[PDB]
Tab-separated table of C-alpha atoms in Angstrom:
chain	number	residue	atom	x	y	z
A	210	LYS	CA	15.533	7.097	-2.810
A	211	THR	CA	13.169	7.814	0.072
A	212	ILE	CA	13.150	4.406	1.755
A	213	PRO	CA	10.465	4.058	4.478
A	214	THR	CA	11.702	3.913	8.064
A	215	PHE	CA	10.351	0.800	9.798
A	216	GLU	CA	11.059	1.209	13.530
A	217	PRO	CA	10.455	-1.727	15.919
A	218	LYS	CA	10.272	-1.226	19.690
A	219	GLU	CA	13.431	-3.290	20.199
A	220	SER	CA	12.898	-3.936	23.999
A	221	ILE	CA	16.366	-2.983	25.300
A	222	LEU	CA	17.835	-5.812	27.369
A	223	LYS	CA	20.748	-6.625	29.643
A	224	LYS	CA	21.996	-9.756	31.336
A	225	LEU	CA	22.286	-10.288	35.051
A	226	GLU	CA	26.028	-9.682	35.452
A	227	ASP	CA	25.602	-6.326	33.627
A	228	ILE	CA	22.633	-5.074	35.694
A	229	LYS	CA	23.866	-2.076	37.627
A	230	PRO	CA	22.517	-2.182	41.241
A	231	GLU	CA	20.749	1.149	41.907
A	232	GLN	CA	21.558	4.833	42.232
A	233	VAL	CA	20.702	6.325	45.602
A	234	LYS	CA	18.623	9.457	45.721
A	235	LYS	CA	20.482	12.084	47.711
A	236	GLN	CA	18.315	15.076	48.402
A	237	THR	CA	18.458	18.434	46.643
A	238	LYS	CA	16.526	21.429	48.104
A	239	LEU	CA	13.807	20.638	50.614
A	240	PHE	CA	10.779	20.073	48.314
A	241	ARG	CA	8.627	23.065	49.004
A	242	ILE	CA	5.098	23.250	47.620
A	243	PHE	CA	4.186	26.591	49.243
A	244	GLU	CA	6.119	29.845	49.607
A	245	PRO	CA	5.332	33.209	51.210
A	246	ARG	CA	4.496	36.286	49.162
A	247	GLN	CA	3.690	39.921	49.898
A	248	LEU	CA	0.136	40.862	48.972
A	249	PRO	CA	-1.737	44.075	49.792
A	250	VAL	CA	-4.444	44.057	52.453
A	251	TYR	CA	-7.706	45.952	52.617
A	252	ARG	CA	-9.509	46.884	55.802
A	253	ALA	CA	-13.215	46.373	56.289
A	254	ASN	CA	-15.123	49.012	54.257
A	255	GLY	CA	-12.835	47.830	51.404
A	256	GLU	CA	-10.110	50.504	51.334
A	257	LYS	CA	-6.394	50.021	51.784
A	258	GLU	CA	-3.818	50.198	54.573
B	124	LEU	CA	-0.137	-16.803	-27.219
B	125	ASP	CA	-1.410	-13.510	-28.661
B	126	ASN	CA	1.932	-11.949	-27.795
B	127	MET	CA	3.556	-15.065	-29.280
B	128	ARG	CA	1.746	-14.546	-32.594
B	129	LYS	CA	2.205	-10.771	-32.433
B	130	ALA	CA	5.966	-11.279	-32.231
B	131	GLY	CA	5.845	-13.371	-35.456
B	132	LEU	CA	5.355	-17.036	-34.486
B	133	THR	CA	2.837	-19.115	-36.473
B	134	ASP	CA	3.500	-22.875	-36.298
B	135	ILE	CA	4.401	-23.078	-32.581
B	136	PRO	CA	1.195	-21.362	-31.295
B	137	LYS	CA	-0.593	-23.823	-33.546
B	138	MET	CA	1.102	-26.752	-31.832
B	139	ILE	CA	0.281	-25.343	-28.402
B	140	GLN	CA	-3.391	-24.673	-29.259
B	141	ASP	CA	-4.156	-27.989	-30.977
B	142	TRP	CA	-2.468	-29.820	-28.076
B	143	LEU	CA	-5.076	-28.470	-25.596
B	144	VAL	CA	-7.909	-30.261	-27.449
B	145	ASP	CA	-6.838	-33.521	-25.725
B	146	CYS	CA	-4.388	-32.370	-22.996
B	147	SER	CA	-2.722	-35.787	-23.278
B	148	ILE	CA	0.646	-36.567	-21.681
B	149	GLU	CA	1.956	-38.605	-24.632
B	150	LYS	CA	2.129	-35.536	-26.875
B	151	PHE	CA	3.249	-33.404	-23.901
B	152	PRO	CA	7.131	-33.839	-24.195
B	153	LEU	CA	6.849	-31.581	-27.266
B	154	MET	CA	6.113	-28.734	-24.829
B	155	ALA	CA	9.211	-29.711	-22.862
B	156	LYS	CA	11.101	-29.966	-26.134
B	157	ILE	CA	9.821	-26.478	-27.022
B	158	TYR	CA	10.713	-25.340	-23.502
B	159	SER	CA	14.313	-26.373	-24.283
B	160	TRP	CA	14.351	-24.980	-27.839
B	161	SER	CA	14.007	-21.442	-26.417
B	162	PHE	CA	17.231	-21.383	-24.406
B	163	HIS	CA	19.428	-22.588	-27.341
B	164	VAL	CA	19.073	-19.229	-29.123
B	165	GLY	CA	21.814	-17.430	-27.133
B	166	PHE	CA	22.288	-14.910	-24.351
B	167	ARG	CA	20.836	-11.387	-24.114
B	168	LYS	CA	24.198	-9.858	-23.239
B	169	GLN	CA	23.043	-6.288	-22.664
B	170	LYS	CA	24.853	-3.445	-20.839
B	171	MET	CA	25.940	-3.193	-17.185
B	172	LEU	CA	23.897	-0.013	-16.748
B	173	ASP	CA	20.570	-1.129	-18.227
B	174	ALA	CA	21.009	-4.581	-16.682
B	175	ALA	CA	21.354	-3.023	-13.249
B	176	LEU	CA	18.383	-0.770	-14.006
B	177	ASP	CA	16.335	-3.887	-14.753
B	178	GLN	CA	16.673	-4.416	-10.970
B	179	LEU	CA	17.246	-0.848	-9.730
B	180	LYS	CA	13.684	0.407	-10.265
B	181	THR	CA	11.886	0.790	-6.973
B	182	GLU	CA	8.378	1.667	-5.862
B	183	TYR	CA	8.338	2.085	-2.093
B	184	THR	CA	5.059	3.257	-0.629
B	185	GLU	CA	3.527	4.502	2.627
B	186	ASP	CA	0.372	2.394	2.244
B	187	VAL	CA	1.530	-1.084	3.369
B	188	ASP	CA	0.564	-2.836	6.589
B	189	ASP	CA	2.518	-2.787	9.831
B	190	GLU	CA	0.859	-5.960	11.189
B	191	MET	CA	2.698	-7.847	8.396
B	192	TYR	CA	6.202	-6.452	8.721
B	193	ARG	CA	6.323	-6.913	12.496
B	194	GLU	CA	5.380	-10.609	12.187
B	195	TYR	CA	7.831	-10.924	9.272
């Protein structure tokens, strides 16, 4: 029998003695946004080195 | 009352129809009397299967509200 599936949001709780303090962020690799890359280059008049 | 007559009852629809002409409470215990004469006919001792299947017929639908069930 295909019963419908009523899902509340359920608002997951704790109490104060069971609140875990925090977990420190220790750093992984150095958070780069840019990196180098080889590209070709073209002298003035347009042609290539 | 049409079902009542269709089942084969003649005098007792007549008592319930001629009572409504006045709707008095002095003749009304008759109704109560009738309401007790129905349950002194016996039990409808049917089968376990079909008696469960009187209850175990379900019509569950994806057209109801959600505003209702959450408040419920």
